[model samples]
Target: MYIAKEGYCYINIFLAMLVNVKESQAKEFTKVVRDKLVGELGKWPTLLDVATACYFLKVFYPDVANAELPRMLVDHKTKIIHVVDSYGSLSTGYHVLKTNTVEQLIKFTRCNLESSLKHYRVG
Candidate 1:
């Protein structure tokens, strides 16, 4: 995997893959993942298995990753994507902070608006 080290953030190719899947999946798929991640991963997928499971789902479903549906994953309260920085710190709670990588992921996921037209229709 390719990792771009920018200050306290490490940008991996997997992140791009994850973003791709998030963009493609309909609300139903995203909901299943979000539920599993939150309910099973406990909002913080620090363990290798949890991380792998989350990452693998995206890998297996490229179209879902590329869909334009809203992400179902939430932080502590609301549904939003959160990334781990170089310091291994997770952005928790509410706040509007602009980070290059963060913005890129958000933009990629939000830009896809044809989720209903994808291979699988999200419930």
Candidate 2:
């Protein structure tokens, strides 16, 4: 099989979402991930994973979380994709934003991914 090389991903297009609601009875929030940051789970963080990290830090460590963190994820650029190709995943909460470029990609990716998955599952 021949691999085709590609790729703007310059914006944070929030797709799906999850709300932890800051459980008062829980010791630590783990609605996103639970691991020692090792093995397969740690190989790479999903966009949701990254956002969850931001949420985790934001709730637990405001000082550091509020600070700039772009430099920290420079290494994770490869694992992350900008398009929301699936039916689930992305962010949490209320807000509104969009761009024509992203809308185009979303439409294209969703169409192809959905069809591909449906086909792959049958065969």
Candidate 3:
């Protein structure tokens, strides 16, 4: 028998397997994950997990990430995608001013959309 960490299996083996899942479902999945990152259930800094989850939202769930969310300004050379909310605020967490990686940048885009969508839902 063989065994491995769930996160490791997620990234390398099962990450993109659900390519046909709906965008909203993808967002919900990501929400749970991001929440877990800071939730009472665990403690981990695995950045790759964030990237993998965000990629799930971006690729498997392209509709919201690609269209409804704040637009992503892509750079072919840097492979970076920048995102800002409707209030002209950059999608940077706490002390993070900007991100230089594609994964983190797209994660920011997903987060911005999540917050903005929340506002819209209640308004």
Evaluate model 3: give its TM-score: 0.27
Give a tens-digit lDDT track for model 2, residues 1-123: 111122212212211111222345233433322343212224333433344344443455333322321111122223333332234433332210121332232333345344321111000
lDDT of 3 by residue, 1-123 (tens): 111342222221122323444654766654554465224223222333344445655564454233322222333343333332235543455422243434444555456344321111000
Cα lDDT for residue 72, candidate 3: 26
**Candidate 2 Cα errors over 4 Å, as ranges:** 1-41, 71-123
Q: Model 1: how far is 60 from its true place, Å?
A: 3.9
**Clashing residue pairs, candidate 2?**
17-91
Residues 1-123 of candidate 1 have per-residue lDDT tens digits of 233333211123233345444444546555555465445544323323332443455555644334322222224343223333234343433332232332343443344464321111111
How displaced is residue 119 in candidate 1, in Å? 36
TM-score of 2: 0.27
lDDT of each: 0.36, 0.28, 0.36
The true-versus-predicted C-alpha distance at residue 79 of model 2, in Å, is 6.8
Name the lDDT value of residue 95 in candidate 2: 18
Please give the lDDT score for candidate 3: 0.36
CA RMSD of all predictions: 15.8, 14.5, 14.9
lDDT score of residue 4 within candidate 1? 30
